[PDB]
Design a protein around this ligand. Structure first.
Ligand code: ZN
Ligand code: ZN
Ligand code: ZN
Lengths: 285, 247, 53
């Protein structure tokens, strides 16, 4: 079916993400407001409001229910605000401003590691806010992480202790892949550079047991690249094009089982890809 | 703001298990169903009985469900699993006696072929269910025989466990937890004083409750019966346990 | 919406070959006769004569 909720906003809408069970709907916007809508059997009703962040909002990401009801917001203002809620009301919990340029993206970490939140701001740095407990957080920093600033961040599925790995890429079209040593340092590993000018979004496919790591990409020049690799521990990342549209591509998304990719860019449209038996990506709708 | 890729007005995204969201500029958030697109289905998920004792009953019960749903390759594969898991094919410890059913071509090789095809089709559901169901001197021979004894290769246990973890995560997504326990039941790797009752005084050894404040506990059904109608400590303590035990 | 048609042919051929190696030429010939054209176009013609004789 088709479900539609009226935004009742006054300015633009930048992102919209639902909840883990499919029983909530969050909306970021440039009105300096967030309006949480309870979607259930086709009905739009309010639950909360975000009347103030000191600026427009860019991207929100829900956290795992294992740890409760936690919502994050990275936006224009240079602040990242969490919304831990208690006793049926949504309340501002904790904020920090560890940047001197607008926060670009936030992406919640896999639940096995803990409750970690990567923050790729526009000032060439990445901050990983770990939950120390008892209402305290730790803020790490890696300065000079980019020459133009990371546009967006992504987390790698967890494998078998543990080895934390995540991917990010800036406006210098030099997408890299990080790592963490035993000490605690975020050492760099590699740097893919088969991109034209910039890379807006980066998304990493979910893992379902297949020995193959797949990373998507979308450049500011029309290109949706699928950087598959199946060389176990040989580290061979071979780009393969999928298309080249008529305008800038904005966001790349994945399925649960990594069979469908949906890319929506500057053309004010959304097209759905796939992966055919031969090895070519075709549209469906 | 030099780094300004500002005018973002469109976006598509997958959410939930069976859902999709997208919005556009002319602007209400329209979602859509994609349940028939992914190889997994919630409807078939709710019906898939599993059991460790009576394997055959599970296979024949799952057989009817796919026909009740519409899928076909399963109403074949489940039948093959039923005929390829009977206790008549029980292995024998001695290596002399008979060739194991694993080394028969319709044994292990069939399992590998089905696993490969459904890996290509990218359907973690059937993988999880099939794997769960199928789960100097002369001394250095019985070890190799036990290695060849099994219908699943001992050299790829990790991938099977990964399948069984992934299906559990998707089941949690859907909203079923009992099934998440049944599936995870098969995974190999692991996940003072005062001991009397208070309503019948017989020693407790199993499942129990108590207040944090009162410190009076007992059998769980006992507390169901007691607190069905009252609000006081059973041992004359005065606690309103509905205001203490719970948060 | 089904399995691909020519899916199990290789397994049938391997089962027959395995049964021939052990020396049970009784089941191989019986399966060949019972099936017929559904399998006759996959085994070499110089092997069938060996089994039959
Ligand atoms: Zn009792
Ligand atoms: Zn008491
Ligand atoms: Zn009490």
């Amino acid at each position: 079916v088709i479900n539609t909720v009226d935004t009742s906003h006054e300015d633009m809408i930048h992102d919209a993400q639902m909840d883990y069970y499919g029983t909530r709907l969050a909306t970021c916007s440039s009105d300096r407001s967030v309006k949480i809508f309870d979607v259930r059997n086709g009905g739009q009703i309010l639950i909360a409001d975000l009347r103030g962040h000191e600026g427009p909002v860019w991207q929100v990401a829900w956290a795992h229910p294992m740890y409760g009801n936690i919502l994050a917001s990275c936006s224009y203002d240079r602040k990242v605000i969490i919304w831990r809620e208690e006793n049926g009301t949504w309340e501002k919990s904790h904020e920090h401003a560890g940047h001197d340029s607008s926060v670009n993206s936030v992406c919640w970490a896999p639940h096995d590691y803990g409750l970690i939140l990567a923050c790729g701001s526009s000032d060439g740095a990445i901050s990983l806010l770990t939950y120390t407990g008892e209402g305290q957080w730790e803020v790490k920093k890696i300065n000079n992480a980019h020459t133009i600033g990371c546009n967006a961040v992504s987390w790698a599925p967890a494998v078998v202790n543990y080895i934390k790995r995540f991917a990010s890429g800036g406006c210098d079209n030099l997408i890299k892949l990080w790592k963490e040593e035993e000490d605690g340092q975020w050492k760099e590993e590699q740097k893919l550079e088969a991109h034209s000018d910039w890379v807006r979004d980066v998304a990493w496919a979910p893992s379902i047991g297949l020995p193959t790591s797949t990373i998507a990409s979308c450049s500011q020049d029309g290109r949706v690249f699928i950087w598959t690799c199946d060389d176990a521990s040989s580290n061979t990342w071979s780009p393969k094009l999928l298309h080249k549209f008529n305008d800038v591509v904005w966001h790349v998304s994945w399925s649960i089982t990594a069979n469908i990719l949906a890319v929506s860019g500057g053309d004010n449209k959304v097209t759905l890809w796939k992966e055919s038996v031969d090895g070519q990506w075709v549209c469906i709708s | 703001d030099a780094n300004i890729p500002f005018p973002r007005t469109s976006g598509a995204r997958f959410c939930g298990a069976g859902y999709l969201v997208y919005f556009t500029r002319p602007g209400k958030v329209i979602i859509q169903d994609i349940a028939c697109l992914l190889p997994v289905h919630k409807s078939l998920g709710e019906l898939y009985i599993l059991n460790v004792n009576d394997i055959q009953e599970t296979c024949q019960k799952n057989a009817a469900s796919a026909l009740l749903v519409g899928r076909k390759d399963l109403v074949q594969v489940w039948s093959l699993a039923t005929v390829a898991t009977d206790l008549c094919l029980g292995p024998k410890s001695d290596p002399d006696l008979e060739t194991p059913w694993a080394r028969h071509p319709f044994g292990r090789q069939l399992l590998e072929s089905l696993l490969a095809h459904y890996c290509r089709l990218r359907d973690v559901q059937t993988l999880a269910m099939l794997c769960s169901v199928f789960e100097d001197p002369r001394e250095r021979e019985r070890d190799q025989h036990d290695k060849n004894k099994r219908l699943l290769d001992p050299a790829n246990t990790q991938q099977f466990d990964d399948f069984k973890k992934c299906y559990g995560e998707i089941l949690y997504r859907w909203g079923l937890r009992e099934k998440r326990a049944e599936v995870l039941k098969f995974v190999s790797c692991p996940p003072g004083f005062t001991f009397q009752c208070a309503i019948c005084h017989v020693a407790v050894r199993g499942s129990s409750n108590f207040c944090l404040t009162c410190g009076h506990g007992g059998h769980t059904s006992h507390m169901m019966e007691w607190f069905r109608t009252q609000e006081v400590c059973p041992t004359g303590c005065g606690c309103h346990c509905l205001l203490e035990s719970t948060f | 919406s089904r399995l691909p048609p020519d899916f199990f042919g290789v397994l049938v051929r391997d089962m027959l070959h395995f049964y021939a190696e052990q020396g049970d030429v009784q089941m191989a010939v019986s399966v060949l006769i019972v099936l017929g054209e559904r399998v006759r176009k996959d085994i070499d013609e110089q092997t069938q004569e060996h089994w039959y004789t």
